[PDB]
Design a protein around this nucleic acid. Structure first.
Ligand SMILES: Nc1ccn([C@H]2C[C@H](O)[C@@H](COP(=O)(O)NP(=O)(O)OP(=O)(O)O)O2)c(=O)n1
Ligand SMILES: [Mg+2]
Ligand SMILES: [Mg+2]
Length: 381
DNA sequence: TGGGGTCCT
DNA sequence: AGGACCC
């Protein structure tokens, strides 16, 4: 009933890919920029005071010698991401994707198959690969410790394979569930791995300063818990279950309370092929229908390129826009003939479709100014 | 004024 | 169609 789970997080992913593209940026402090924001930066820049998700002004101010690379086109990063996911799928068929650079792999069955091959005299030769959380002493007779050590061996093999086959470095965390693996992956960064033995579990769960640092607790839930006087992990462990159920609903309360103890009963789910494609474009303002129509033709073009390559045809189109000052969206199924024609000029009809979806949301007669325009193809089959 | 994704309601 | 979460 006890598992072995590994979590893989790539170091400065966008920056890493940009460095692989042209090695001219290997030692220069590098930051990947999308509009007025630096999503990530090279670790050389991270030394200079540059942080992830800084303003471009705050980045160049704290580090003027910073070199910036535009990263609004995610195509190369996406290619690398799925190469990583496939590589990990080689080890175990079930690999769950989180983000572009995070991956969960269930090593349990693989670890057992490994253990049955070893002999009684060899069970003493098992050694850890990478870091052990909190320098915890290993009990070679504790079977859980052994299985987690094998998990660290498989994790090291995974990272070595990633570097030799894709030229990518990453951090890994081996634990007994998903939450603890993802939490223990980032203990030693960059390009280091850490295994967490059960005794140290509580320590890790209290190393956190605030509760938002837990996956599954976002801005809304954390704001509500701040309003409820919950500011620490122990504050959530000790909170009355009934009151929390009443304030957050039944499901969320049970789940985040179980998370508050580091308990994760979730299994690794084979992510497989993506359930949707989408292209985004933001700006300061857009106040012309023809202005919006051209951007929709652009996003529509890139999406048309992407859908014909997957071989899976989308069955529903969605338009999302954000007005100036929240998001709003209107979708509809794609007609039968244009679905079949994908793979014939399919450009002209789709536009009209989206434009209809556009005119429903915004009255062209009344003035308007749009902040965000995004197109999505979903319901792939 | 980031550019994507997931599932639940 | 919107809302919560993740990177
Ligand atoms: N809000 C976000 C978060 C991440 N990303 C992209 C940029 C990152 O290169 C990539 C991975 O994000 P991340 O793992 O949170 N931090 P990154 O991998 O850049 O460096 P580490 O801090 O993991 O070493 O996703 C984004 O575009 N918008
Ligand atoms: Mg990450
Ligand atoms: Mg990362």
């Amino acid at each position: 009933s006890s598992r072995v789970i590994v979590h893989v997080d790539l170091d400065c992913f966008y920056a890493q890919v940009e460095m692989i593209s042209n090695p001219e940026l290997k030692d220069k402090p590098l930051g990947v920029q999308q509009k007025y924001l630096v999503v990530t930066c090279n670790y050389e820049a991270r030394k200079l005071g540059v942080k992830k998700l800084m303003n471009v002004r705050d980045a160049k101010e704290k580090c003027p010698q910073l070199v910036l690379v535009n990263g609004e086109d995610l195509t190369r990063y996406r290619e690398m991401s799925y190469k990583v996911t496939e590589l990990l799928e080689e080890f175990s068929p079930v690999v769950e994707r989180l983000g572009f650079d995070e991956n969960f792999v269930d090593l349990t069955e693989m670890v057992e198959k490994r253990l049955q091959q070893l002999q009684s005299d060899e069970l003493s030769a098992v050694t850890v690969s990478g870091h052990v959380y909190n320098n915890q002493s290993i009990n070679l007779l504790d079977v859980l410790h052994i299985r987690l050590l094998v998990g660290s061996q498989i994790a090291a093999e995974m990272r070595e394979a990633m570097y030799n086959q894709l030229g990518l470095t990453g951090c890994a965390g081996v634990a007994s569930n998903k939450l603890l693996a993802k939490l223990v992956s980032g203990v030693f960064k960059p390009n280091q791995q850490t295994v967490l033995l059960p005794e140290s579990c509580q320590h890790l769960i209290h190393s956190l300063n605030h509760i938002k640092e837990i996956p599954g607790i976002g801005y809304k839930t954390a704001k509500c818990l701040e309003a409820l006087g919950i500011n620490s992990v122990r504050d959530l462990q000790t909170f009355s279950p009934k009151i929390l159920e009443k304030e957050l609903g039944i499901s969320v309360a049970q789940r985040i309370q179980k998370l508050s103890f580091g308990e994760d009963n979730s299994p690794v789910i084979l992510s497989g092929p993506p359930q949707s494609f989408s292209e985004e474009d933001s700006f300061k303002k857009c106040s012309s229908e023809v202005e919006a129509k051209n951007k929709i033709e652009e996003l529509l073009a890139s999406l048309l390129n992407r859908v014909c390559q997957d071989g899976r045809k989308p069955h529903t189109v969605r338009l999302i826009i954000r007005r100036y000052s929240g998001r709003e969206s209107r979708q509809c199924p794609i007609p039968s003939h244009v679905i079949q024609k994908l793979g014939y000029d399919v450009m002209t009809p789709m536009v009209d479709i989206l434009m209809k979806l556009f005119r429903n949301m915004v009255n062209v007669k009344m003035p308007f100014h749009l902040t965000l325009l995004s197109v999505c193809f979903c319901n792939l089959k």
